[PDB]
């Protein structure tokens, strides 16, 4: 009786659970635009303000939980992408569930403290919440699990420099700028490796997932590092069509970003 | 070769065993659908092209024992209403695609002894067929399956709907 | 059941299947057989 | 009776013989900080001073012995990494032993002439002494031999330009700077190739050293040259996990070092 099998792929349900949140609520906001609130808005604004102690400890907490979620994803990346499991049996899924409900509460608190709802809805933190939080609820409901876009929490590493600034660890502007550049580069490297790993190990959808390549996450990190330095050994490369398209887009975006960030590098070098 | 048995349109029995066959071209039985017995045992067949048995219509009992087949595509077998018995013993078949048995009505006799069956969600249609069509007790004892990670002591017919409860049906 | 279709039976649970060119194990297996002979039968997998 | 076999790997003993020197003595220095000497300190300072004849001939001697040790390592790199041998039978090991005891005496003489012991303990010369000298004593005691970190003596090539300066061979500052840059580049190239060769031919430790790749030292030198020029043929590459990690770190460090050294290259080009 105890057995585990892949069965039928259910990735589309998990993806739709985020798409019909994001796009549908964006349309709702647009239609509302076409067609004690101040007190609670001010209360939520002072709740998440970086000046007060509560905002500081809360952003430190959400950064720590994002680090924990990234570690959980790193651990779970050594498993089959789609697999059945029992929510009550395993407690790591419970830890991820607690992390994600905390993220959801933080997102709601941020949304209350928003002067412009539409521009808040297009932030990177909002979209990472949209593409991270509904999948865990769908997974615990369906009693299955899909790897999905759980690496996108690494995009919160951009806040890392700010986490230092109000703990009296960084004072000068040059060190803050250097830490910001390093964090941005590391975060985009990790998330690009995450997309490459997902699209390579998942396989092509229109070819019944027969193009899957057994690539670990760290091998994809190595591939991204080799590619971004314009070395290209060719020992490991993307074989799927969508993987190659993503590699081309990543090459173009990385070259454009480096060309845009050259002047900041020169300023850091200085005279 | 294609059309190897051309001219024998009224053929009824055809036996090919101990010949060591290793490659059968598609549509090689053009006009041989009238046969009822087809023995392709004791050979080295590995893969079957889809539509190979499609010209066969009056075939009743088919034997594929002692071969090197690993995956049996449903398209290769097709729909044979007049088939009554089928044999896959002494092969290297691990799992059967769901819905393969439902294509044909009559599958009264089936022999799967010696295949390295890896019991799993995939085998659940076969187990359901065993519930509908019980095997002989001796054949049930002989036919077993491999349990991954542990001993293969679990019989194929010992599974019930509780094992099927793990399988996720298409969502409503 | 104690006697396989192609093999020979000897009392004491002895089964002889010498020089039969069996592709695999014969189906005649029983608890009574305490000695099975499968020499030079061209078997290749277990 | 005469036979040679690898047996059990003893690399950890050789590595620990340097770690429990370096870290333990660093802790001893720290604890001493928490809790005729001037005459002998001045004597040792004037002994190793570059102004006097003794200091000049002694630094020339230690540079020559470093060259000899590098040549010995180059010769011994064509052998199995861990092997049993007789100290009395072979005299090349005796030559290396004499070189290393001279290095130890020089290190002691330097340590006496140190105003700040802790900052002396973190110098590259001190750490190369720590990771070179105890292994030969452990090898001669255990009657075995491990290749180890004996390529790090190439890091003493950096003083090569200084060796010319007080022999009336270089006078202008531009030539001195050019020779310094060339020596630094050559030394870091050689030591990176040494680490790559060691980590590739040794194999992964957690996988029972079954990932060993038959790469010669010069093949690794060729690989480093191909990588640092951003060519990346892919004919030879690191297959082990630790080798790939070291390659990624070397790529990042080389790019950063080249970006930092661009202005000196421009100054050498001049107008
Ligand atoms: C406080 C802030 C927030 C963020 C953070 O700190 C800072 O929080 C920390 C904390 O929260 C950490 C987590 C705590 C809980 C940890 C759980 C741990 O898994 C456990 O690992 C154990 C290893 O002995 C057991 O695993 C079983 O081990 C058996 C062999 O001993 C196998 O057999 C069996 O399979 C395994 O069982 C494993 O677990 C299930 C048990 O039924 C399944 O069988 C599953 O398959 C299998 O794999 C156990 O059973 C399993 O649970 C996991 O490896 C890492 C883990 C998640 C941790 C990751 C890092 C963190 C997030 C830290 C993070 C930095
Ligand atoms: C994908 C690939 C990557 C590599 C690359 O291609 C694409 O990237 C491209 C891109 O990154 C380029 C760089 C972009 C930024 C450029 C900056 C530019 O300096 C500009 O020069 C101006 C001159 O007027 C400004 O000068 C100010 O002028 C003020 C008076 O008006 C004064 O004050 C004071 O002088 C300055 O203040 C100021 O000094 C600066 O705005 C410099 O002269 C060349 C530069 C560094 C470029 C060099 C070549 C590149 C690296 C290109 C390179 C091939
Ligand atoms: C003065 C400054 C300081 C630095 C420096 O100059 C400037 O000092 C110089 C000087 O010091 C040089 C060293 C002197 C001693 C040299 C020794 C030499 O090895 C010798 O090579 C011989 C070759 O015929 C013999 O080797 C044996 O040869 C047999 C065939 O003829 C094999 O059979 C047998 O195996 C070999 O035997 C070898 O040696 C052992 C003898 O039993 C073992 O068998 C061992 O296995 C095997 O390999 C001999 O037996 C072996 O010893 C080695 O090749 C280079 C060597 C070390 C030199 C390297 C370069 C130096 C350091 C120079 C360096 C620049
Ligand atoms: C997709 C790839 C897009 C690549 C370019 C992204 C540019 C983002 C950008 O400029 O962010 C800006 C706006 O933020 C946005 O404009 C966010 C855009 C979200 C796109 C979501 C697509 C979902 C498809 C299914 C600023 O973002 P920030 O949070 O102010 O920093
Ligand atoms: C590594 C793997 C690949 C990762 C990248 C792949 C992909 C990311 C691609 C978008 C980069 C971010 C755009 C928004 C943004 O913040 O722009 C920034 C730079 O960016 C630009 O100046 C625009 C770059 C446009 C790239 C268009 C690629 C189209 C394919 C603004 O820079 P600034 O300092 O504010 O000026
Ligand atoms: C390890 C890799 C480290 C890479 C960066 C090294 C930077 C060294 C550096 O700046 O040297 C400086 C200090 O010297 C030090 O700070 C020496 C640091 C020694 C680290 C030893 C690690 C041993 C681990 C087991 C200057 O060195 P110098 O001798 O003044 O030239
Ligand atoms: C001048 C000093 C340079 C070199 C002195 C001589 C060193 C190499 C020659 C002896 C080693 C050799 O060929 O043996 C084997 C290894 O094969 C190789 O070593 C091939 C790779 C050579 C890389 C280029 C040499 C160093 C680059 C420049 C370094 C500049 C510092 C033969 O291999 P096979 O038979 O193919 O198996
Ligand atoms: C420090 C954190 C870095 C690393 C922490 C450790 C992560 C890797 C080690 C565990 C994974 C591993 O080796 O398993 C398998 C995958 O093999 C690889 O992962 C090999 C490729 C490694 C790429 C370099 C690591 C990240 C680069 C730098 C990233 C910087 C961020 C073994 O493969 P096999 O046996 O060959 O099959
Ligand atoms: C070739 C193979 C790879 C070898 C390199 C790999 C590895 C060596 C990495 C450290 C380089 C040396 C640091 C200390 C130092 O002397 O800095 C120098 C440069 O260096 C810098 O300006 C800092 C470079 C930081 C690189 C961080 C890499 C992290 C991974 C100071 O330069 P300056 O002219 O004094 O200014
Ligand atoms: C920027 C983010 C938030 C939104 C963009 C949507 C991206 C991430 C989506 C759109 C199409 C998606 C792919 C569509 C099909 C499959 C096949 C299946 O095996 C799951 C993964 C994979 C390969 C998906 C990965 C994620 C994907 C590439
Ligand atoms: C900068 C220097 C002085 C200190 C840094 C420590 C480095 C050199 C150490 C730490 C871990 C070490 C590795 C650990 C394990 C093994 C496996 C074994 O087969 C010996 C070599 C090898 C591959 C070691 C090579 C040296 C190593 C990489
Ligand atoms: C199938 O073939 C004939 C039907 O003509 C029948 O006698 C025979 O017993 C059948 N074979 C098996 C294995 O049931
Ligand atoms: K290249
Ligand atoms: K290049
Ligand atoms: K290349």
Ligand nearest, relative to CA of residue D224: 9
Query: Which residues does chain A have within 8 Å of residue B167's beta carbon, measured at their own beta carbons?
Result: 5, 7
A107 φ, ψ (degrees, to nearest 5): -65, -40
Q: CA A83, A85, A88 angle in degrees (round to 5)? A: 160
- Give bridge partners of residue B61 from the DSSP assignment: B37, B85
Residue C4 tokens, joined = 């396989």
Atom number in ligand 4 closest to CA A125: 29
Pairing of strands D82-84, D144-146: antiparallel
Beta-sheet strand order (sheet of B109-111): B13-15, B37-39, B61-63, B85-87, B109-111
Interface test with chain A among D224, D232, D245, D258, by most A beta carbons within 10 Å: D232
CB contact burial D145-170 (16+ within 10 A = b; e otherwise):
bbbbbbbbbbbbbbbbbbbbeeeeeb
CB D10 within 8 A of CB D142: yes
Tell me the C-alpha distance between D130 and D136, whole Å: 11
The DSSP result for chain C, as a single string, is: --S-SSSEEETTTEEE-TT---SS--S---SS--EEE--SS-----
Q: Is C42 left (phi over 0), alpha (psi -120 to 50) or beta?
A: left
CA dihedral A5, A11, A16, A19 (to 10 degrees): 140
Pairing of strands B109-111, B85-87: parallel
Burial label for B119, CB within 10 Å (0-12, 13-18, 19+), is buried
- Give bridge partners of residue B86 from the DSSP assignment: B62, B110
Is the four-CA dihedral D206, D212, D217, D222 of positive or negative sign?
A: negative
Residue B78: half-sphere exposure toward Cβ, Cα within 13 Å: 16
Gap between the terminal Cα atoms of chain B: 48
> Strands, DSSP E only, in chain A?
82-84, 144-146
- What are the CB-based long-range contacts (under 8 Å, 24+) for B10-19? B10/B34, B11/B35, B12/B36, B12/B37, B13/B37, B14/B38, B14/B39, B15/B39, B16/B40, B16/B43, B17/B41, B17/B42, B17/B43, B18/B42, B18/C21, B19/B43
Enumerate residues 6+ apart whose C-beta is below 8 A from B103: B74, B77, B78, B79
Pairing of strands B61-63, B109-111: unpaired
CA C9 to chain centre: 9
Tell me the C-alpha distance between B112 and A191, whole Å: 49
Coil, strand or helix: which one is A169? coil
Pairing of strands B37-39, B61-63: parallel
Residue A54 tokens, joined = 């509560």
Of A225, A235, A269, the CB nearest to D234: A235
CB B127 within 8 A of CB B103: no
The residue of chain C nearest to residue B17, with distances taken between CA atoms, is C23
CA B72 to chain centre: 7
Tell me the C-alpha distance between A68 and A85, whole Å: 21
Q: H-helix or E-strand containing B62?
A: strand B61-63
CB A237 within 8 A of CB A251: no
Of B162, B163, B170, the CB nearest to A8: B170
The DSSP result for A226-257, as a single string, is: HHHTT----SS---SHHHHHHHHHHHHHHHHH
C-beta D123 within 6 A of ligand 6: yes
Of A218, A221, A233, the CB nearest to D232: A233
CB contact burial A209-241 (16+ within 10 A = b; e otherwise):
bebebebebbbbbbbbbbbbbebebebbbbebe
CB D227 within 8 A of CB D250: yes
Burial label for D219, CB within 10 Å (0-12, 13-18, 19+), is middle
CA of D226 to the centre of ligand 15 (A): 9
CA of A92 to the centre of ligand 1 (A): 6
Nearest to B121 by CA among D69, A4, A10, D116: A4
Nearest to A192 by CA among A234, A226, A231, A144: A226
Tell me the C-alpha distance between D8 and D198, whole Å: 18
Burial label for B166, CB within 10 Å (0-12, 13-18, 19+), is middle
Interface test with chain A among D228, D238, D244, by most A beta carbons within 10 Å: D244
Tell me the C-alpha distance between B4 and B35, whole Å: 14
Resolution in A: 3.1
CA of A227 to the centre of ligand 9 (A): 21
D170 φ, ψ (degrees, to nearest 5): -125, 130
Question: Which of A90, A99, A156 for mutating ligand 1's site (highest number of atoms within 8 Å of CB)?
Answer: A90
The DSSP result for chain D, as a single string, is: -------S--HHHHHHHHHHHHHHHHHHHHHHHH--HHHHHHHHHHHS-SSSHHHHHHHHHHHHHHHHHHHHHHHHTTS-SEEE--TTT-SHHHHHHHHHHHHHHHHHHHHHS-S-HHHHHTSHHHHHHHHHHHHHHHHHHHTEEE-TT-GGGGGGGGGHHHHHHTTTS--SHHHHHHHHHHHHHHHHHHHHHHHHHHHHHH--TTTTT-------HHHHHHHHHHHHTT----SS---SHHHHHHHHHHHHHHHHHHHHHHHHHHHHH--
Pairing of strands B61-63, D144-146: unpaired
Is the four-CA dihedral D80, D86, D88, D89 of positive or negative sign?
A: negative
Tell me the C-alpha distance between D47 and D41, whole Å: 10
Residue with CA nearest ligand 1 atom 49: A90
CA of A93 to the centre of ligand 14 (A): 43
Nearest to A115 by CA among A54, A55, A37: A37
Packed helices D92-112 and D37-47: angle between N→C axes, nearest 10 degrees: 130
CB B3 within 8 A of CB B26: no
Coil, strand or helix: which one is A62? helix
CB B132 within 8 A of CB B157: no
Contact C27 B90 (CB under 8 A): no
CA of A109 to the centre of ligand 2 (A): 43
Residue A119 tokens, joined = 């521009």
The residue of chain B nearest to residue C42, with distances taken between CA atoms, is B42
Tell me the C-alpha distance between D236 and A49, whole Å: 54
Asked if A114 reaches chain B (Cβ–Cβ under 8 Å), the answer is: no
Report which DSSP code applies to A111: H
CB D83 within 8 A of CB D22: no
The residue of chain D nearest to residue A236, with distances taken between CA atoms, is D234
Ligand nearest, relative to CA of residue D153: 11
Tell me the C-alpha distance between A257 and D250, whole Å: 23
Residue A114 tokens, joined = 């928003």
Place of tokens 């990176």: D192
Tell me the C-alpha distance between A256 and A260, whole Å: 6
CA distances from A19 to A14, A124, A130, A183 (A): 9, 15, 8, 28
Neighbour count for residue A37 (Cβ, 10 Å): 7
């Amino acid at each position: 009786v105890p057995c585990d099998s892949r069965g039928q792929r259910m990735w589309w349900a998990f993806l739709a659970s985020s798409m019909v949140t994001f796009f549908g609520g964006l349309f709702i906001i647009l239609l509302w635009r076409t067609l004690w609130m101040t007190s609670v808005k001010d209360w939520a604004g002072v709740m998440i303000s970086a000046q007060t102690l509560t905002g500081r400890v809360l952003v430190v907490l959400v950064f720590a939980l994002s680090i924990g979620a990234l570690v959980i994803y790193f651990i779970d990346s050594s498993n089959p992408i789609e697999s059945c499991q029992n929510f009550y049996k395993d407690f790591t899924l419970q830890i991820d569930m607690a992390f994600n409900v905390f993220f959801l509460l933080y997102f709601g608190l941020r949304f209350i403290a928003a002067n412009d709802k539409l521009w808040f809805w297009l932030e990177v933190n909002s979209v990472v919440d949209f593409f991270t939080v509904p999948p865990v609820f769908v997974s615990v409901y369906l009693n299955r699990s899909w790897l999905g876009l759980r690496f996108l929490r690494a995009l919160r590493l951009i806040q890392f420099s700010e986490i230092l600034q109000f703990l009296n660890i960084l004072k000068t502007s040059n060190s803050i700028k250097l830490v910001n550049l390093l964090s941005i580069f590391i975060s985009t490297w990790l998330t690009a490796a995450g997309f490459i790993h997902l699209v390579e190990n998942s396989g092509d959808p229109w070819e019944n997932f027969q193009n899957n390549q057994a690539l670990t996450y760290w091998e994809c990190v190595y591939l991204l590092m080799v590619t971004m330095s314009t070395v290209g050994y060719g020992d490991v490369y993307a074989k799927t069509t969508l993987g190659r398209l993503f590699m081309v887009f990543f090459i173009l975006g990385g070259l454009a970003m480096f060309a845009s960030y050259v002047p900041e590098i020169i300023e850091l070098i200085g005279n | 070769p294609p059309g190897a048995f051309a001219g024998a349109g009224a053929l009824q029995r055809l036996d090919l065993r101990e010949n060591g066959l290793h490659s059968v071209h598609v549509r090689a039985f053009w006009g041989l659908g009238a046969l009822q017995l087809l023995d392709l045992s004791a050979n080295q067949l590995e893969a079957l092209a889809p539509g190979t048995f499609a010209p066969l219509r009056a075939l009743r009992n088919l034997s594929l024992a002692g071969n090197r087949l690993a995956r049996l595509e449903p398209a290769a077998l097709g729909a044979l209403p007049l088939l009554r018995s089928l044999s896959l013993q002494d092969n290297e078949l691990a799992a059967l695609a769901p819905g393969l048995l439902g294509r044909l009505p009559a599958l009264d006799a089936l022999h799967l002894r010696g295949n390295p069956w890896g019991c799993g969600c995939a085998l659940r249609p076969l187990c359901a067929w065993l519930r509908r069509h019980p095997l002989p007790a001796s054949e049930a004892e002989t036919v077993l399956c491999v349990w991954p990670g542990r001993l293969t002591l679990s019989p194929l017919t010992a599974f019930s709907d509780a094992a099927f409860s793990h399988c996720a049906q298409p969502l409503a | 059941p104690d006697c396989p279709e192609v093999c020979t039976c000897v009392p004491g649970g002895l089964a002889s299947c010498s020089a039969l060119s069996l592709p695999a194990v014969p189906p005649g297996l029983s608890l009574r057989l305490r000695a099975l002979l499968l020499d030079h039968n061209r078997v290749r997998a277990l």
